[PDB]
Design a protein around this ligand. Structure first.
Ligand SMILES: COc1cc(OC)cc(C(=O)N[C@@H]2[C@H](O)[C@@H](CO)O[C@H]2n2cnc3c(NCc4cccc5ccccc45)ncnc32)c1
Ligand SMILES: COc1cc(OC)cc(C(=O)N[C@@H]2[C@H](O)[C@@H](CO)O[C@H]2n2cnc3c(NCc4cccc5ccccc45)ncnc32)c1
Ligand SMILES: COc1cc(OC)cc(C(=O)N[C@@H]2[C@H](O)[C@@H](CO)O[C@H]2n2cnc3c(NCc4cccc5ccccc45)ncnc32)c1
Ligand SMILES: COc1cc(OC)cc(C(=O)N[C@@H]2[C@H](O)[C@@H](CO)O[C@H]2n2cnc3c(NCc4cccc5ccccc45)ncnc32)c1
Lengths: 358, 358, 358, 358
């Protein structure tokens, strides 16, 4: 029984998510992407965008654009590895979307305009069963981070779920084992050296909400606030009010790194922490949290699908010799690639669980 | 009698133009910028943007934001070197602008939405007397390139003028001395290595009109088209249908270079062309066309206000040993800074001539 | 009978060449890289450099560093896909290299210090049979561009061959078909928008020979001279003194594009030229010269091994409507990747022909 | 009595220092730069390098290259604002420099090859009096940070002084007031997002000592270690073994930022710390420690000569709501410009004190 999904909003996020599905070879067999929705239905343009990625290169699958009817002037259907995907026109209100008419049960909300629990529900009123917001959510939506708290998903209570953010998906895993392995965490501050994103400007532009955010992105180091710190508090309750952090947008199109500085509950050492993270990466966190012993740089993590990949050498070489409480942990993450795979993982999980409970 | 001007659209272009007025020390004495119009009237945000520029640095003048009335919650008035500038709320149709009520005679149209002669004329219906479009125009608007054909401006015939484009303001000067010095020009192809601009995207985004133009700007070499070639045909009629060119957008926030390859009418040499350009730069083109004998790079032309600055070394060293017809000329230009000064020079010219003819 | 090859100089060029060999799955079976020579014999460092590449990503083969004798402190042997490569200490004079002692017949001279025919011959005096300079040569060394004039290679006369440069390998193929298909070429000027290289500096630095070439590389458009223009005159005699060109180094780590402007001998059209290049690419130039009908950017050519891939849309869209003589041709090239594959192709060709003639 | 100074090593650092002098308008009157030493004496090249800077732009003073004798083929004398500066030939051993013969008392060691106390003393053996190493020093040399411990300079005991590093000159000031204002500092970890430098590579290159540091600089986030953390322990004794930090080299040619995370001794608040830093910046730290309330970005600090400029907004907005011990402090610094001005200030301080004690 292929999971009927729909993607509302086919921008960087949307496409990435779709590509992640196709990349995992789930298209057709496991997941059926009935359709994608956006301000345009020009399938030829979508194929172009999918076939060529500045950062992620060429896809391992075949993409072609065709016409639903030999009547239509411009393609409106996408064909990935044979499977057919419908390019549907966008709506101002999610409830106006023909989800029920199309047979879509799970809608991936990635337009960034419906991050509010109430507004997102519109998809269900449109005929959808479940909605997964590919970004932080507001309005009391269940936030989940694969590898940290997916077990808290309630098929009967949760209908609008949030996959949090890319940064949160990198920090939470670390914080998760730090607390689970009973290392404790009195308080902590994290800084993320983050690659610039679509919301930024090429040259100095307009940004009334975020003044710094409007400055030339690939020529500046741009400070910015982030909720990934507090958000982890929702996935890991015990950390509420103990964690906070900021971001530094820098001249890279993709891949970011987390720098966590925290104080432990009981005396320990950087070595202990090191081994515990590695051990977790090889056991209950495999696939989500990984690690490296190599002298790597951002470029080396492109297309790495782990939500968080711990940098052992960087960590061990930059802590106090015999410190027992104050530590710094460094973990990388492909802010685009990994997050996308997590959205897929979240959907498959929910679907598998929604079916199990019947 | 200070020229009463109004800037419609206060983005990069609008500000740069305004900064060029201030930088030239014309604010107040020579030019009276009665007001600027944008979707926002937040003078504090405008002050911020003017006081800090990634590429051009800090201004040589003082900029402060004040309140028209102590009642207003957020500053709506800009104070540059004592002169007061009004921050007015934008309108959908230029004709609704209170130009006449503000006493504005010359309007600088730089929103990018009224490049059409018919739409731009709305400012005049709004009360303005003359309009200068800070970009290429359509609908039969007189196009002028200072130092090439300002003498063709007709106070009684032209009311909506276009200052052309940055690139055109770089090529025209060259082509102008090439034809004036009777070198001739059978045909010519020009390629411009241009810095990326506001219309581009930080990361792969949406660009239906220009597909390549949607790719990550600071990380790719992006081919694009340019009308600068044909436009020079309107400023210099003799070149109609003889010129054409293309552009390559590269990873630089500012400063571009023009690579002109053309075939001369009569036998000559690159040394001849070289001496001529330098001669013209020192005489009838001074201030508009300049040149350099130094081993410079793009950064070296930041804040250079000449529309086009000829590169002697680069030219002399890259032509055929004894060629007599087929040549290549290289000239730099600060695509932001110079163009901005030109808009100011055009306004001052129009104003002086409008007044002279009474 | 595995070709015995030795790499002198294991820098960007040398490694790329090596990776090209391994990538083509030639390591061991077809080509035996007996050893690589450099200022360091630290195999662990070389492994690191080969296992991680900022631009080309991770290798498809396995690389491991081991010790020749359990005695040595630091590994001095590289093991790729099982094959053992010796890491040998560099020498001031190539004649001091143990080529004969190692059984090396073909030496890849890529240190950039022995581009002179006389100095390169030192390898032969050292025991080697043939020398391939992975760069433009001087001193009368035979220059060869695969796909254009490899047939002119003489196993008895040519012992020190030059693969030319990346730029020459992109332009020659084009020029080759232009002349072969009898399009003619009175004169021609080419400009290459080239990615920065190892010879450049991160921040303004020292470069007595090339003043401009010493300025911050990733933040400037840096003009420079190129011999790729004249060099094509040696591979395609008929073009001697007819071609010339220049380069513009821009802020990209890899991939460049050639902008060729030329005047044909007989009347023709850009469409004729377009179809001809596409035909040549699909026939006698397949593998060397390719083409594209897509709206691509530099990043799309990363890892493309064709010496030159013609841009059809960019070319057709930027030429004069009904021009018959003056044209512009656009072709891209992964200046690093493709050139490397050519070096390997040159070597295999030579080796096959040296054996045949006996 | 003009301070007789000599610059050994005229690279980025050297020039910067020399330009700092001229910029301050000290050249000639206060400081007499008798000469500069480097592998080359080509004054014309030096003038070029000084008249054009990718990051800092054009100089406010005039630079010209002349010949000591109308005999010499290439200029060997620099003429800034009239003052004459000799361009001397470099030596392998500092003791072989004609410092005594030239009348140079204070030598600025900025070659990076003589950071060792013992080797640097060679300048004094060459006839010099005092030596200032424009970089961290080893061998037990007195390290001083203007605004933090210049008073600890002993004219009779210290003959080889170290101005520390750019990063240390940024963190020290902050830590200084943190301790002086009795906020206390149990332990502290600092991360510095640093622009790339001359030691890095444009494309993946050779770097045996620092493997990651060899990777393409302007296209990666590169982790690295830094002694700036421990170094503050020598300038501020009470901080020994309490501080430690790391660095992240990002794609920016200049300007860096410090992210300090520390635990205080007694209960306090971020607001307290904020007001304290500002107070200190207006009083005893003026000229060394500055601050901003604006939404700035890296580019906004170019040409800022303060050793450290505290970011109040960034700081206040990214700490825990009611935290009393665990805090984060952010401060920018033009790693090139500021440090250079400090070197000059150190020299003027030492000279004024050397003379005072007689
Ligand atoms: C690729 O094709 C194009 C072409 C285009 O230009 C016309 C814009 C976009 C674009 O913005 N594309 C957006 C971008 O790629 C991504 C947001 O991160 O999702 C897209 N997007 C934005 N709004 C969307 C929507 N409903 C909202 C909506 C629908 C109808 C009217 C509205 C009026 C006011 C405010 C909202 C309105 N439904 C689906 N995708 C959306 C995409
Ligand atoms: C700096 O402050 C802000 C804040 C903001 O968001 C709230 C948007 C902008 C912005 O877009 N800023 C634009 C940008 O800075 C610059 C274009 O290069 O001009 C601005 N701009 C956009 N439209 C403008 C206009 N009339 C058009 C117009 C007026 C009224 C309603 C309209 C409805 C639909 C379509 C057009 C409408 N008049 C003047 N400046 C304008 C600037
Ligand atoms: C990773 O290993 C390292 C370490 C290093 O630092 C010490 C430098 C390099 C490096 O420059 N590496 C260079 C770089 O990778 C590449 C040139 O693009 O070739 C390397 N290279 C430079 N000279 C070489 C040589 N013989 C010349 C030579 C050898 C011995 C003495 C000489 C004295 C004077 C003049 C020439 C001398 N043989 C092999 N590779 C060479 C490589
Ligand atoms: C423009 O002028 C040029 C030209 C050049 O190439 C020809 C190299 C440089 C350059 O490297 N320039 C170096 C660079 O700009 C900076 C160090 O970061 O200082 C320069 N530098 C390096 N060594 C120097 C020295 N004595 C040391 C020395 C002197 C003589 C021989 C030595 C042999 C082995 C080891 C050390 C040797 N004295 C002054 N400046 C120096 C500068």
């Amino acid at each position: 029984a292929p999971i009927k999904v729909g993607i509302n909003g086919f921008g960087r996020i949307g496409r990435m998510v779709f590509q992640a599905i196709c990349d995992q070879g789930l298209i057709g067999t496991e997941i059926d992407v009935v359709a994608v929705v956006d301000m345009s239905t020009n399938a030829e343009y979508f194929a172009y965008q999918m076939k060529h990625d500045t950062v992620h290169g060429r896809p391992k699958y075949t993409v072609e654009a065709v016409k639903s009817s030999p009547s239509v002037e411009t393609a409106d259907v996408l064909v990935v590895n044979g499977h057919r995907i419908k390019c549907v026109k966008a709506q101002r209100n999610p409830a106006d979307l023909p989800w029920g008419k199309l047979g879509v049960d799970y809608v991936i909300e990635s337009t960034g305009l419906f991050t509010d629990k109430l507004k997102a529900e519109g998809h269900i009123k449109g005929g959808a069963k479940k909605v997964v917001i590919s970004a932080p959510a507001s309005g009391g939506a269940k936030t989940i981070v694969m590898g940290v708290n997916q077990h808290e998903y309630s098929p009967a209570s949760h209908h609008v779920v949030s996959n949090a953010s890319c940064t949160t998906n990198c920090l939470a895993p670390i914080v998760h084992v730090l607390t689970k392995e009973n290392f404790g965490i009195e308080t902590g501050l994290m800084t993320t050296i983050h690659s610039y994103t679509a919301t930024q400007k090429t040259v100095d532009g307009v940004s009334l909400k975020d003044w710094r955010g409007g400055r030339a992105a690939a020529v500046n180091i741009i400070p910015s606030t982030t909720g990934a710190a507090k958000a982890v508090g929702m996935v890991i309750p015990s950390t509420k009010g103990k964690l906070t952090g900021m971001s530094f947008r820098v001249p890279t199109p993709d891949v970011s790194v987390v720098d966590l500085t925290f104080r432990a509950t009981r005396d320990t050492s950087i070595q202990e922490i090191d081994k515990a993270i590695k051990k977790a990466a090889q056991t209950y966190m495999k696939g989500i949290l990984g690690f490296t012993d190599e002298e790597l740089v951002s470029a080396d993590f492109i297309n790495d699908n782990r939500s968080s990949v711990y940098d052992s050498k960087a960590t061990l070489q930059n802590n106090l010799p015999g410190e027992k409480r104050f530590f710094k942990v460094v973990s990388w993450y492909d802010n685009e690639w990994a997050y996308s795979h997590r959205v897929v993982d979240l959907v498959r999980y929910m679907a598998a669980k929604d079916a199990a409970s019947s």
